[PDB]
Design a protein around this ligand. Structure first.
Ligand code: NA
Ligand code: NA
Ligand code: NA
Lengths: 181, 181
């Protein structure tokens, strides 16, 4: 196997989900709003290549999401998504998008006002797993102080942080147009 | 570049899904039952290797599912699942399991009493798709005339049917203990 670097030996790491869920739930509300995708690990499901801007609305229990940016063809693209508690009572969320599936999503760490470090992990039946990570920011850019928080977080459950690829963001993005869909 | 049989170049074939909710929809409502996995194509997610027995019960708009059988480690395993309409209102279903994800799913064909042919496909952004196919029976056995039905249905959407592997079923299975969970 020369590929891919999102399939990884062993089973999905233990991340102390109950603890995160206990800490994050009373603040769930401050997770609402706009998050920009600062960086992610290799992801075969992402259709929005650049200017990735995620609009989160909260209904008191689940989130609805509008994701926008420029697709791989250079065109504007909008994808609807949802973020809600596991439908089986596990201490984590499901993130679900159209023309896609639903995956576990854990927030390893967030301050709500600057950054969030996201983790999705799926176990196979042959003793491997594949995971998918994200660094979210409230700005088109993220301070080194915060990038360093997610780095430690991802090192802490042995996600290889060299796997992160920076997302195009900043003044060249049509955020203003993205807002209107 | 050793490539799994279930990762295939190209996009997910188009099934007219709207046509499948017309055909493959029963005269009268089926509220409860059990199917046995007769055969499937290679699947890295399926944790139950042998004796796969799928009991469903209907509530509201989702089938509650209990999957049991023998795991790859030789031990009995039970898995809880849910089946509901795609939440973004795509003309297909989500099949969702505890400790895994929710995948899209279509019933390619069935007669409600003998067999059912099921299909799940998803598109990747790097020019591949993964699909996963199932033949179900209401008993361990299945007449070859129904197997031929599923084969044609799968061949008709360009699934190499030489990918199917028969699942161990029969009196060697501890169905009874499986029933107790
Ligand atoms: Na990845
Ligand atoms: Na923001
Ligand atoms: Na009902």
């Amino acid at each position: 196997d020369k590929i891919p670097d999102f399939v990884v030996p062993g089973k999905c790491a233990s991340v102390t989900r109950n603890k995160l869920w206990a800490e994050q739930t009373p603040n769930r509300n401050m997770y609402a709003g706009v998050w920009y995708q600062f960086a992610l690990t290799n992801n075969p499901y992402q259709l929005i290549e650049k200017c990735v801007r995620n609009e989160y609305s909260f209904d008191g229990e689940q989130f609805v999401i509008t994701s926008t940016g420029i697709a791989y063809d250079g065109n504007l693209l909008k994808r609807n998504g949802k973020l809600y508690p596991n439908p089986f009572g596990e201490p984590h969320l499901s993130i679900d998008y159209e023309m896609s599936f639903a995956a576990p999503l854990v927030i390893l760490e967030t301050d709500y006002s600057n950054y969030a470090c996201l983790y999705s992990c799926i176990d196979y039946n042959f003793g491997y797993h594949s995971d998918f990570s994200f660094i979210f920011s409230r700005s088109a850019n993220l301070a080194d102080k915060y990038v360093k928080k997610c780095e430690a977080a991802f090192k802490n459950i042995n996600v290889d942080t060299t796997r992160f690829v920076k997302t195009v963001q900043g003044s060249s993005c049509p955020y203003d147009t993205q807002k209107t869909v």
